[PDB]
Amino acid sequence: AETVSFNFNSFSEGNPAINFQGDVTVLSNGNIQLTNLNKVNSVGRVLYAMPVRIWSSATGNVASFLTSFSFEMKDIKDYDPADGIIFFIAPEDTQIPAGSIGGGTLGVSDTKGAGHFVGVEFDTYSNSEYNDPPTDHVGIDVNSVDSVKTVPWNSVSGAVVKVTVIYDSSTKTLSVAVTNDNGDITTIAQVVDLKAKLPERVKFGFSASGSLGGRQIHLIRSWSFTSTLITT
Amino acid sequence: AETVSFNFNSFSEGNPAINFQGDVTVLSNGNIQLTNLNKVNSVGRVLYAMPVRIWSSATGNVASFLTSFSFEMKDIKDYDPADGIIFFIAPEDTQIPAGSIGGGTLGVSDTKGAGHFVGVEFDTYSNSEYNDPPTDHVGIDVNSVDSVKTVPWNSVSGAVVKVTVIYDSSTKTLSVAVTNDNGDITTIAQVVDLKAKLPERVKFGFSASGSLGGRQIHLIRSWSFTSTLITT
Amino acid sequence: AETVSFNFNSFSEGNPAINFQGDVTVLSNGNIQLTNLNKVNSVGRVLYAMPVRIWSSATGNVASFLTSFSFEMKDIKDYDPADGIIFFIAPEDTQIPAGSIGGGTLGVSDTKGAGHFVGVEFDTYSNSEYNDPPTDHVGIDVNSVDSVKTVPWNSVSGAVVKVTVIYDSSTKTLSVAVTNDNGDITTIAQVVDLKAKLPERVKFGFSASGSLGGRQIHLIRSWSFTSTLITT
Amino acid sequence: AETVSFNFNSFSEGNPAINFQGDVTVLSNGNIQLTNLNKVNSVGRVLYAMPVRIWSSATGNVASFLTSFSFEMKDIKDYDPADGIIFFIAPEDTQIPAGSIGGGTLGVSDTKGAGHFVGVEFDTYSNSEYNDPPTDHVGIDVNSVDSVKTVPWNSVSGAVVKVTVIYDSSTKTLSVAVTNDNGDITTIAQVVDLKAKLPERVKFGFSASGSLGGRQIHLIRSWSFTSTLITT
């Protein structure tokens, strides 16, 4: 089998294993800060630099994967704590959408909320234009920030959040477990056919955005990943 | 919400938080050893002593859970490396089946392979009587060691194996990710309705067994768990 | 710290983690075959596709690394069993030298034997033009196939050879242990300053070559690697 | 060429291939447990029972060696996690020092920290009396627990640690690569003249110790070794 495996306990500028897009910076403590607090419609994204072959047009086989990551969102004075973080999967050529308005697009979609990606969003602002639920939520996204499914959640300012994601290729199930600061777990799961929605070669990563009035600290603290694709 | 949370980095026999059944021992290094290498049809099981409420007859709500554990199976001289370990969920009064033959029953079922439990098995011996696949496998079990579903796997002697399990109550999906020695990940997922198959209060644990000619070292190294049941 | 880790138990065409250069083919059993047995001056090379940051111009720190691989060289009828395999480190833009004569150049150097690379060679033909010792040898190469140091060795046709390499950044020591078919070990070690000889970002890989009369089967069976760079 | 080669995937009490010294026990899972958790100044050691000819008095030749082993250190309640494990080389008659205080001596030296041995220590307690660095470390020891050289390291409780050691006789270089749980590699290398510091035949092994307050689980899980001495 063909396996991609990596582990990030911290990050650094100049690591060729990571692609930095837009307003991303690396802090002295090793955290990735995705948005620029002094910029309007800030968008920042980090991708694992090596494309991952999630399915093969030759065999028809689809990869399974296990990934864990930790993040932190923290309020800043005067601005609305917005807009959130999205763990996403997209074609290997993926770039921040041209003329991105940031905000509710989470740096992955156009103004209408459409894009070419699969993702798990940690949404901290209710955008009526994307049919967002009224509270903070975890959502499963398939080519749109108008989520296929959401679950109520609570983004606590300054809290370290732990996420575990399992994609089971045979059932096409994307399962997510979110470990909150109050000790409770939040789960969400959805059948998503990655072979039907995405090309063979993809990139994995994180994106976050803000607006003129909606800004917060978006931090990626750690990321581990393993994908395995059965080969002929 | 109602949350049960625990973490075992090590295990000890004086700790009332675990119930010990059958031939199980705790080694001085802190590991749980489920079977006795010198006994015919050895069966050893371990359960978290406190019953966990997984669903409510009042609200109809079912808990979600995230659990991770690590185990090790190691070959012993002159014996077939058998039979395997099962992570299981059973009614709170669960006991080793009376007159257990161990072996392919994995200490949770009768001779016909039937029992009252939901489990994830790490099977290392092909029992034709339980329609086992020809190789080592991970199976999702619902009241039978004749698995609802299996996935090929490889039990590497002396390797530390890491497992992550997500149960998403809304989709009723039990998703499993197993991290092997060769670096590959193996996943298996199955829709299992816990309300329909198990009582409101259950015990979680591990079981392993052997036969006259089938024996191996079965070890539980660590276990973390979090369940959350919505009470509104 | 910044760590790069990978493990290849087998190889496949289409794996984005591997760059194929020249006459390389992947066999149905998963082995990489580096040279074409029917081509004059055949050269084949495989590289890990991601550039590896081996030193930082910001901190002055140099990475340490541990790598293991298994290869096989097998005689073919009538041709001289030549020329061997080189495990090498080179600038990220590395290509087979233009107008390569293959042969004693091992696909990494020009006709005079000069190139931009650091390598461990498994040399099976004595090239007087590169001051080769009279027998098969393991050599440490610094920008030349005229080795800084060599040790007598024996390339056994059809034998699986295991190699372990340690690069200790603090002492700048490259240490090699070669495990033969007859059970004996061969070692060679050399102080090589990678920060002085190579750029910050590099590619790691394997190269092999042949000539008109010098041809043999050159196989790469497995490859594991871990590098760690202290960050500040 | 005179070669010594062995492989231990597990260990057993009834095997004359290993010499057991002091408080050492074999657990039912096959691991060697070096210290007794209920004893003051506990010292336990294991040696490969056959002496290894590391050098010739006839030719003046010195052996090269390649060795790999895996170990585990685990914290125990109410005791300081101390003192660590040493992989050592000593005269064939080597015994635990008479009236050993255990602790910082690592079971290989006297109260002043002096002994007759060459070793690689995995030291988890800072002994100012042996000029230990302030954190956990890997050290290269020559007749003293006051290390010739150290490198900062981190002993993770319950983690399986893999070590690879290369001794290159021509450069007299002892190179060590330590693979941690967080994925990082730690290396240390030192020129050590084995012919000048040790006798013709030596014993290879492992030692660990504790004190009244400093105690932890010290486990040896596996050990492979190959040495080759050129006889021509």
Ligand SMILES: O=C(CCC(=O)N[C@@H]1O[C@H](CO)[C@H](O)[C@H](O)[C@H]1O)NCc1cn([C@H]2CO[C@H]3[C@@H]2OC[C@@H]3n2cc(CNC(=O)CCC(=O)N[C@@H]3O[C@H](CO)[C@H](O)[C@H](O)[C@H]3O)nn2)nn1
């Ligand atoms: O000061 C106070 C009271 C302070 C306070 O805490 N008061 C508390 O009151 C309590 C009881 O109420 C208690 O008494 C308590 O003791 C007391 O302390 N209010 C007055 C007040 C404060 N802002 C803030 C909050 O919301 C406004 C303003 O600052 C940011 C935000 N904005 C509004 C706008 C206007 N553009 C637009 O609507 C067009 C574009 C637009 O909305 N894009 C969206 O902007 C979002 C962010 O708002 C997202 O990023 C979206 O994704 C993005 O699409 N752009 N940015 N607006 N009005």
Ligand SMILES: O=C(CCC(=O)N[C@@H]1O[C@H](CO)[C@H](O)[C@H](O)[C@H]1O)NCc1cn([C@H]2CO[C@H]3[C@@H]2OC[C@@H]3n2cc(CNC(=O)CCC(=O)N[C@@H]3O[C@H](CO)[C@H](O)[C@H](O)[C@H]3O)nn2)nn1
């Ligand atoms: O020696 C060799 C070849 C060894 C070898 O390495 N050969 C190598 O081959 C190489 C090339 O291939 C090379 O040539 C190499 O040079 C050469 O060394 N075979 C001859 C041989 C060896 N056993 C072993 C393996 O299987 C047998 C025997 O030892 C264990 C097992 N059992 C079972 C019994 C007693 N029954 C019963 O209890 C009957 C009921 C029964 O089968 N319950 C099941 O028993 C299982 C375990 O077998 C499971 O636990 C099941 O869950 C359980 O239901 N009693 N024993 N049986 N026959």
Ligand SMILES: O=C(CCC(=O)N[C@@H]1O[C@H](CO)[C@H](O)[C@H](O)[C@H]1O)NCc1cn([C@H]2CO[C@H]3[C@@H]2OC[C@@H]3n2cc(CNC(=O)CCC(=O)N[C@@H]3O[C@H](CO)[C@H](O)[C@H](O)[C@H]3O)nn2)nn1
């Ligand atoms: O048949 C036998 C004895 C066989 C045998 O088993 N004899 C046994 O002896 C026993 C007792 O000892 C018993 O009596 C037994 O009964 C008897 O059977 N020799 C007569 C004989 C055989 N070739 C062979 C070996 O070497 C020659 C020939 O086949 C291959 C090679 N090449 C080379 C060429 C074309 N040049 C060039 O390309 C010139 C440039 C050149 O030399 N580049 C180098 O070529 C190398 C490869 O040779 C390397 O690849 C170098 O890196 C490369 O730089 N074209 N060919 N040349 N002459």
Ligand SMILES: O=C(CCC(=O)N[C@@H]1O[C@H](CO)[C@H](O)[C@H](O)[C@H]1O)NCc1cn([C@H]2CO[C@H]3[C@@H]2OC[C@@H]3n2cc(CNC(=O)CCC(=O)N[C@@H]3O[C@H](CO)[C@H](O)[C@H](O)[C@H]3O)nn2)nn1
């Ligand atoms: O409880 C606490 C804080 C616990 C804690 O978690 N605090 C947390 O702090 C957090 C924020 O920081 C939070 O606030 C949190 O809420 C709070 O819980 N300290 C008070 C405290 C605890 N021991 C421990 C640690 O060190 C002592 C004690 O237990 C073991 C050790 N020993 C030693 C002895 C007996 N001597 C001798 O034998 C003298 C000779 C001696 O020192 N040979 C050396 O002993 C070593 C081992 O200590 C090595 O083995 C050396 O190789 C050996 O040479 N007898 N005992 N000594 N003093």
Ligand SMILES: [Ca+2]
């Ligand atoms: Ca939103």
Ligand SMILES: [Ca+2]
């Ligand atoms: Ca040559």
Ligand SMILES: [Ca+2]
């Ligand atoms: Ca110490």
Ligand SMILES: [Mn+2]
């Ligand atoms: Mn949303």
Ligand SMILES: [Mn+2]
């Ligand atoms: Mn050469």
Ligand SMILES: [Mn+2]
């Ligand atoms: Mn020390």
